[PDB]
Short mmCIF file of C-alpha atoms in Angstrom, two decimals:
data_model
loop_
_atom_site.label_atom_id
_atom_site.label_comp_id
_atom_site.label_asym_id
_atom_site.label_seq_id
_atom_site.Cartn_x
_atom_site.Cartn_y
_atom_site.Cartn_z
CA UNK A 13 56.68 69.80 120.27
CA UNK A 14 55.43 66.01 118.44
CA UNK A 15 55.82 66.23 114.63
CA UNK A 16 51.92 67.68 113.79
CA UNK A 17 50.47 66.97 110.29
CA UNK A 18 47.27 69.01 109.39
CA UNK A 19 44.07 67.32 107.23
CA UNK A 20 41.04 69.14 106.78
CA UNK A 21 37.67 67.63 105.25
CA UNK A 22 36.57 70.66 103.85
CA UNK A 23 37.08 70.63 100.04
CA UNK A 24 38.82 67.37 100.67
CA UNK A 25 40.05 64.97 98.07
CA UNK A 26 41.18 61.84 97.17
CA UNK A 27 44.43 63.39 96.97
CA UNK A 28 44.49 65.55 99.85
CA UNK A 29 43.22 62.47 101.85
CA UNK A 30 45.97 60.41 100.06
CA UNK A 31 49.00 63.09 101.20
CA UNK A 32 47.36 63.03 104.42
CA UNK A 33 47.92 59.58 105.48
CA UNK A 34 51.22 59.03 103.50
CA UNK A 35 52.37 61.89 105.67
CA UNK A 36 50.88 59.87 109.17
CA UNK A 37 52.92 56.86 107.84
CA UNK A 38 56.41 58.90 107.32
CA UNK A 39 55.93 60.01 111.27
CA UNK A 40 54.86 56.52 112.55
CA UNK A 41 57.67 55.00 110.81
CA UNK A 42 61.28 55.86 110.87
CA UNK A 43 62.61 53.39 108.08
CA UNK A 44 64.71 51.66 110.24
CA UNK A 45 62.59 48.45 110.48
CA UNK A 46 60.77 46.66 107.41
CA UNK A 47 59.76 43.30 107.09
CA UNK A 48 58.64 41.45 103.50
CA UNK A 49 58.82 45.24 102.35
CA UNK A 50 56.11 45.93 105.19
CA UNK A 51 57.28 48.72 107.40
CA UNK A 52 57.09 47.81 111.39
CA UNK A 53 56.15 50.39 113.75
CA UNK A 54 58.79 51.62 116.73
CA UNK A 55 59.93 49.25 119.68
CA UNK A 56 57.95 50.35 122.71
CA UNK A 57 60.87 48.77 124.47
CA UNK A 58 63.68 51.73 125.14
CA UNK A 59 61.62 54.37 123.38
CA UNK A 60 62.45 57.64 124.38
CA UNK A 61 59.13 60.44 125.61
CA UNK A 62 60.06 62.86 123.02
CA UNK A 63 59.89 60.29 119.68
CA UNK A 64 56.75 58.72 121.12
CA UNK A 65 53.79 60.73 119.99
CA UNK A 66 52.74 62.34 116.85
CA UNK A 67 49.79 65.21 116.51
CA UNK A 68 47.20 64.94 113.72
CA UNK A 69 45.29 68.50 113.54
CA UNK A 70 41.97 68.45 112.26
CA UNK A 71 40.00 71.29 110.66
CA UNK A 72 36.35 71.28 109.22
CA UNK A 73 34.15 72.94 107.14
CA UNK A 74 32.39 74.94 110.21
CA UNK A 75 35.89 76.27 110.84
CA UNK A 76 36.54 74.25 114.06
CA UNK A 77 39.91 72.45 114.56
CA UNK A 78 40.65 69.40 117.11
CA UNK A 79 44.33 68.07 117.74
CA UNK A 80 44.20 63.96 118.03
CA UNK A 81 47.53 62.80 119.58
CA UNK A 82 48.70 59.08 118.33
CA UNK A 83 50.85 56.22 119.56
CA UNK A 84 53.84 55.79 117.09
CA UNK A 85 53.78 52.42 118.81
CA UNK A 86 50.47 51.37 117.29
CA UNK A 87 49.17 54.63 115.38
CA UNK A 88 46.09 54.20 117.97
CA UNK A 89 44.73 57.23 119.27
CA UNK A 90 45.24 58.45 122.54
CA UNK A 91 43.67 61.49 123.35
CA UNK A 92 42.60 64.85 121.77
CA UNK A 93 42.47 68.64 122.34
CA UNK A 94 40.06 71.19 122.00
CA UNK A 95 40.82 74.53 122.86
CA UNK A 96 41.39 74.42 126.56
CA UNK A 97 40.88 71.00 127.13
CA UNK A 98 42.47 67.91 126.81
CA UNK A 99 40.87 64.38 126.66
CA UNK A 100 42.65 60.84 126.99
CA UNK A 101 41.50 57.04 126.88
CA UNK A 102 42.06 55.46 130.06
CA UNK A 103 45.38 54.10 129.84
CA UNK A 104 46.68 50.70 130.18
CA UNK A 105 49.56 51.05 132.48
CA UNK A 106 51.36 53.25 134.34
CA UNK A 107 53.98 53.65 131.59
CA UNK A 108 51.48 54.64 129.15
CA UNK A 109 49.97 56.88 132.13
CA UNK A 110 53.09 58.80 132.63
CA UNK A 111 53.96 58.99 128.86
CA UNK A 112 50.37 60.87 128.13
CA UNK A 113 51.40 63.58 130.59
CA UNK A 114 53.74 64.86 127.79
CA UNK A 115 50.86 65.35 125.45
CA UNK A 116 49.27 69.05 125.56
CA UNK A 117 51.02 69.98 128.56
CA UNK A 118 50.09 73.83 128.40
CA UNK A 119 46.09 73.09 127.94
CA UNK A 120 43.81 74.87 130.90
CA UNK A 121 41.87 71.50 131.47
CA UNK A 122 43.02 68.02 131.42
CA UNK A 123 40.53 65.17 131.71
CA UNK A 124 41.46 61.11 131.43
CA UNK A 125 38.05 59.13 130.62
CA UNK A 126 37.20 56.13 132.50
CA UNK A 127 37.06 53.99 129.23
CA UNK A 128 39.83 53.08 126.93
CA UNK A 129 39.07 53.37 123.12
CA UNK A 130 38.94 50.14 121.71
CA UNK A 131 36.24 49.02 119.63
CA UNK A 132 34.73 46.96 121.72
CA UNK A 133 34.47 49.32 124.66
CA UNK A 134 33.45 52.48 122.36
CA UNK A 135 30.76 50.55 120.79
CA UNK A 136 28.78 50.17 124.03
CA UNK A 137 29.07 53.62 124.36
CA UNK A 138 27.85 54.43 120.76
CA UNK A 139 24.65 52.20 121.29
CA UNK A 140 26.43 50.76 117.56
CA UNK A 141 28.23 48.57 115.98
CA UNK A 142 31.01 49.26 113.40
CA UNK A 143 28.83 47.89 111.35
CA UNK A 144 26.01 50.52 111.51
CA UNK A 145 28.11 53.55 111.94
CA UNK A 146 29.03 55.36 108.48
CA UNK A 147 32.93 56.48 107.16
CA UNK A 148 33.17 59.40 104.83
CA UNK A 149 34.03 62.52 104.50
CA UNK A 150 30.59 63.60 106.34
CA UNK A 151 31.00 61.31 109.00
CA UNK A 152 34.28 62.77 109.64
CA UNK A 153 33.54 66.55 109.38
CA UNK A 154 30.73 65.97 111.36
CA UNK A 155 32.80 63.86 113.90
CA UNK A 156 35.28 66.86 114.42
CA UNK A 157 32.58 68.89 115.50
CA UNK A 158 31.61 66.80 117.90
CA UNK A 159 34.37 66.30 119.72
CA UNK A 160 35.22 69.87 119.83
CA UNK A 161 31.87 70.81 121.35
CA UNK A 162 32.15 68.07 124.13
CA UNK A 163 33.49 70.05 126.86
CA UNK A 164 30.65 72.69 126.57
CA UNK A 165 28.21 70.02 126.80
CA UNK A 166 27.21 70.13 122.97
CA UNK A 167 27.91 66.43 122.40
CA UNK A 168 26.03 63.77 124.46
CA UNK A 169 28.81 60.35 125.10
CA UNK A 170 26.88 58.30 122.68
CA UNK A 171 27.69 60.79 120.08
CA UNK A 172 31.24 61.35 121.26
CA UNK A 173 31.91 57.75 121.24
CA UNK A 174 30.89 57.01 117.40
CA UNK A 175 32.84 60.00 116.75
CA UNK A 176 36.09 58.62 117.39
CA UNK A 177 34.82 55.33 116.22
CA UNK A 178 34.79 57.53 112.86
CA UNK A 179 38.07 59.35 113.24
CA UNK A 180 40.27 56.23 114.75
CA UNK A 181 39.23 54.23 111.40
CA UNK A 182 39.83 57.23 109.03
CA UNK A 183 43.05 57.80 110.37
CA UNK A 184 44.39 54.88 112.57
CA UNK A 185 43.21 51.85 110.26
CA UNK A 186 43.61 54.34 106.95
CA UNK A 187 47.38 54.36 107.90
CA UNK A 188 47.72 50.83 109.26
CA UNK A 189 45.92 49.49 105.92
CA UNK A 190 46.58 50.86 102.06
CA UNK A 191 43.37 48.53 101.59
CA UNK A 192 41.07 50.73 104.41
CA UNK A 193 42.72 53.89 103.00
CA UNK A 194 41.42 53.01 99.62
CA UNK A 195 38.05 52.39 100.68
CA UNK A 196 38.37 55.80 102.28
CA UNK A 197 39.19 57.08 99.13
CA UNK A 198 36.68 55.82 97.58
CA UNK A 199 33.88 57.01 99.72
CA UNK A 200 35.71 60.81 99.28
CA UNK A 201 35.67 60.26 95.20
CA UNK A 202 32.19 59.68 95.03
CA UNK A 203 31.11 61.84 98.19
CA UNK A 204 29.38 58.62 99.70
CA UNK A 205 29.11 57.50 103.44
CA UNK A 206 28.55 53.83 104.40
CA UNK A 207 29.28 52.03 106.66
CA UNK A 208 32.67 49.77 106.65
CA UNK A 209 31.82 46.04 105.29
CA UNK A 210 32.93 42.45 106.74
CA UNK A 211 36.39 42.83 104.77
CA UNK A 212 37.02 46.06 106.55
CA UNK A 213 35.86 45.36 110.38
CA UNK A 214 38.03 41.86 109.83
CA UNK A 215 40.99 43.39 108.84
CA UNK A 216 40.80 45.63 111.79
CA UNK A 217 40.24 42.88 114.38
CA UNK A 218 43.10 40.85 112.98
CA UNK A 219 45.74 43.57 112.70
CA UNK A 220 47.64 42.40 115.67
CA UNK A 221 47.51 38.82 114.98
CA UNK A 222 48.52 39.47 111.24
CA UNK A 223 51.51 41.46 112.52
CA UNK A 224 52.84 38.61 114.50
CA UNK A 225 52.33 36.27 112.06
CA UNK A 226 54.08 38.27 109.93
CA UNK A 227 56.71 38.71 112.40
CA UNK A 228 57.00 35.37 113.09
CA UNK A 229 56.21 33.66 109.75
CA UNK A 230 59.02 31.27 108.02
CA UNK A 231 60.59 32.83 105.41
CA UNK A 232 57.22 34.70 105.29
CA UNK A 233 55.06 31.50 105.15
CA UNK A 234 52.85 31.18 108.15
CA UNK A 235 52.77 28.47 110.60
CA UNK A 236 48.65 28.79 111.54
CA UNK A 237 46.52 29.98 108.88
CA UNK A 238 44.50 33.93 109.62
CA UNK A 239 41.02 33.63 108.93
CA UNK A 240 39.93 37.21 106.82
CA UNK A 241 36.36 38.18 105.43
CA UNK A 242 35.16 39.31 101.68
CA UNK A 243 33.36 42.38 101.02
CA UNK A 244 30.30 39.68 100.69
CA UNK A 245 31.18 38.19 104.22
CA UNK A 246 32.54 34.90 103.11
CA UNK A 247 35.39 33.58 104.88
CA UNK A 248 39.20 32.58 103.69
CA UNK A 249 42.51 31.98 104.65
CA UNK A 250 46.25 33.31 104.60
CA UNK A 251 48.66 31.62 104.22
CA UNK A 252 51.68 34.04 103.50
CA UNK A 253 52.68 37.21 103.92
CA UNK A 254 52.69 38.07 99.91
CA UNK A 255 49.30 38.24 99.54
CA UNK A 256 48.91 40.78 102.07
CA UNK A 257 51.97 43.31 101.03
CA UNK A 258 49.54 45.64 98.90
CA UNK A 259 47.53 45.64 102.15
CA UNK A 260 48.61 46.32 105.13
CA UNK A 261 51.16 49.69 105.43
CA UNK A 262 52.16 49.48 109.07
CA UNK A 263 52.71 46.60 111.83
CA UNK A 264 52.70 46.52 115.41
CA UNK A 265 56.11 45.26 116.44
CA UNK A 266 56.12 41.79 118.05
CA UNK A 267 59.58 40.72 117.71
CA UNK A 268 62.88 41.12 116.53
CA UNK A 269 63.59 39.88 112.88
CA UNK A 270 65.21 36.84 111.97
CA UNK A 271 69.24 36.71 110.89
CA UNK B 5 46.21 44.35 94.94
CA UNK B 6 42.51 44.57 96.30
CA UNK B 7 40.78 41.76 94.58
CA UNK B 8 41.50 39.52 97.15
CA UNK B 9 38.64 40.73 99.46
CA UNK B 10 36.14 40.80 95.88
#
C-alpha cells in the first residue's frame, strides 16, 4: 500500500494542521533533489508505480472519513475514496490512465469523471470563483462530508466541485507553499473562513512557471521577471529565487540541475 | 519571510 498520512479537522490546530502538511512534504519529497534549498518534487520520467502515489485520509467532526490519493509528481490530487467507491479526475494521458488503476484497487465501485480538476475546469462546475469560495477549517470539515455523501446522491456537482476546490488548496497548495500553509494556519488560530486573497490565487497560478524559473534561473537570478500579487491586489515582480525560499516548499520538476 | 505579499 502508498505511504497514508491521517489529518482530521475535528479539534484541529495550528499544530496538528502544521504536522499534517510537514508530514505530506516528507512523502512528496525524497531528499534527493533540492534546488536554492527548495526541495523539487520526483522525476515523472522513470518513476516506478509503487513510489508514485501517496494517500491523505481525512476524518471529520461527523465521524466520516474520505481517502484523497496525490501525485508525488505535483502533490495534485487525483482521485478519492469513500467507502465503496472510488472517484478520479479525468486523466491526461494514458500513462497517467494506467498509473491511477493502482490506486484503491480493492474498492466495490470505480468511477473516472469526465472533468479533470484544475481550477479552471472545477470552477465552472462550482458556479465560483476561488475568489468567492471560503478556506478554513469549516470549509474543510464541511468539504469532507460532501464528498463522502456523493455516491448516495447527498451532494449535488456544484457542491462536490467547490469541495475539492477547498481540499486541493488546504492540502495541495498548503504543501506546495509555507506562505498558503500559513494563511491556513491562520484561519485555524482564529477559527475564521474567508476566502483566499489576490496573493494567494497568484501564487497558485504561477506555481509552475515559478518552478521553472527556478529551475532554470542563473545562479538563481531569473532571466524574465514573474509577475505576483499583494494581499491588496497590487502587482510586482521577481527577480530571484531568494526572495521566494521562505515561500514556496515544493517544485514541480522541469529540468535537471546545473553542474 | 511573508512581508513580501503585505
Amino acid at each position: 500500500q502508498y505511504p497514508i498520512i491521517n489529518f482530521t479537522t475535528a479539534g484541529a490546530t495550528v499544530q496538528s494542521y502544521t504536522n499534517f502538511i510537514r508530514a505530506v512534504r516528507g512523502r512528496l519529497t525524497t531528499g534527493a533533489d533540492v534546488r536554492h534549498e527548495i526541495p523539487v518534487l520526483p522525476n515523472r520520467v522513470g518513476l516506478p508505480i509503487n513510489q508514485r502515489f501517496i494517500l491523505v485520509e481525512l476524518s471529520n467532526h461527523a465521524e466520516l472519513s474520505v481517502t484523497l490519493a496525490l501525485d508525488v509528481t505535483n502533490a495534485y490530487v487525483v482521485g478519492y475514496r469513500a467507502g465503496n467507491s472510488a472517484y478520479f479526475f479525468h486523466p491526461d494521458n494514458q500513462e497517467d490512465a494506467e498509473a491511477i488503476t493502482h490506486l484503491f484497487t480493492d474498492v466495490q465501485n470505480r468511477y473516472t469523471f469526465a472533468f479533470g480538476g484544475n481550477y479552471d475546469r472545477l470552477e465552472q462546475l462550482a458556479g465560483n470563483l476561488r475568489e468567492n469560495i471560503e478556506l478554513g477549517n469549516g470549509p474543510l470539515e464541511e468539504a469532507i462530508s460532501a464528498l463522502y455523501y456523493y455516491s448516495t446522491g447527498g451532494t449535488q456537482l456544484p457542491t462536490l466541485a467547490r469541495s475539492f476546490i477547498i481540499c486541493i488548496q488546504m492540502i495541495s497548495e498548503a504543501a506546495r507553499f509555507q506562505y498558503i500553509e500559513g494563511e491556513m494556519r491562520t484561519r485555524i488560530r482564529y477559527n475564521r473562513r474567508s476566502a483566499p486573497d489576490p496573493s494567494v490565487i497568484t501564487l497558485e497560478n504561477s506555481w509552475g512557471r515559478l518552478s521553472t524559473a527556478i529551475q532554470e534561473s542563473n545562479q538563481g537570478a531569473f532571466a524574465s521577471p514573474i509577475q505576483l500579487q499583494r494581499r491588496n491586489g497590487s502587482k510586482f515582480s521577481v527577480y530571484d529565487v531568494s526572495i521566494l525560499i521562505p515561500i514556496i516548499a515544493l517544485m514541480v520538476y522541469r529540468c535537471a540541475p546545473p553542474p | 519571510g511573508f512581508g513580501l505579499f503585505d
